């Protein structure tokens, strides 16, 4: 009924993980309440540089699938910061309208890295969440928490 045809209001979820230092940290960002198919995806993830240290983004092929029609974008800027991007030209096969989890991000929590809570700030303004209809109908909070243990003699 209401969906497709109608918008509605999509939450970008986040949550709170834990690490040590030298600990690798995965954080998943939690796709809720759509229902109707999402095709233009765009976020920036600015985080601190000199605690954690980003591997690679696992994708989430349920939701993102054929990467390879360049839906799959992963810009690596400058230290910090991580543009990822995905937009999906195959949404007519795949209509990205079912819950789940986008992206599983890994971070590696530094060696000196200090301990306590860091969040990776994701920018709400570069955060672009659009349909086909290009609607941007996200309700998004995202500032992925890594609370540090720090369970060494320091770090």
Do not use: H, R, W
């Not at 009924?1 to 970008?12: D, Q, R």
């Not at 995905?86 to 530094?110: H, K, M």
């Not at 920018?123 to 086909?132: N, W």
């Amino acid at each position: 009924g209401s969906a497709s045809v109608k918008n509605e209001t999509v939450k970008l979820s986040v949550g709170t993980v834990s690490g040590n230092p030298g600990d690798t940290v995965k954080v998943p960002v939690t796709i809720s309440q759509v229902s109707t198919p999402v095709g233009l995806i765009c976020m920036d993830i600015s985080y601190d540089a000199s605690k954690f240290t980003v591997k690679d983004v696992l994708p989430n092929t349920d939701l993102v699938k054929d990467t390879d029609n360049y839906s799959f974008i992963v810009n690596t800027s400058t230290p910090g910061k991580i543009s990822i991007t995905f937009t999906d030209p195959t949404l007519a096969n795949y209509p990205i309208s079912v819950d789940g989890i986008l992206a599983y991000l890994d971070f590696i929590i530094n060696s000196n890295a200090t301990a306590g809570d860091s969040a990776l700030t994701v920018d709400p303004a570069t955060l672009i969440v659009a349909d086909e209809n290009d609607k941007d109908i996200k309700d998004a909070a995202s500032n992925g928490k890594i609370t540090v243990t720090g369970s060494a003699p320091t770090s």
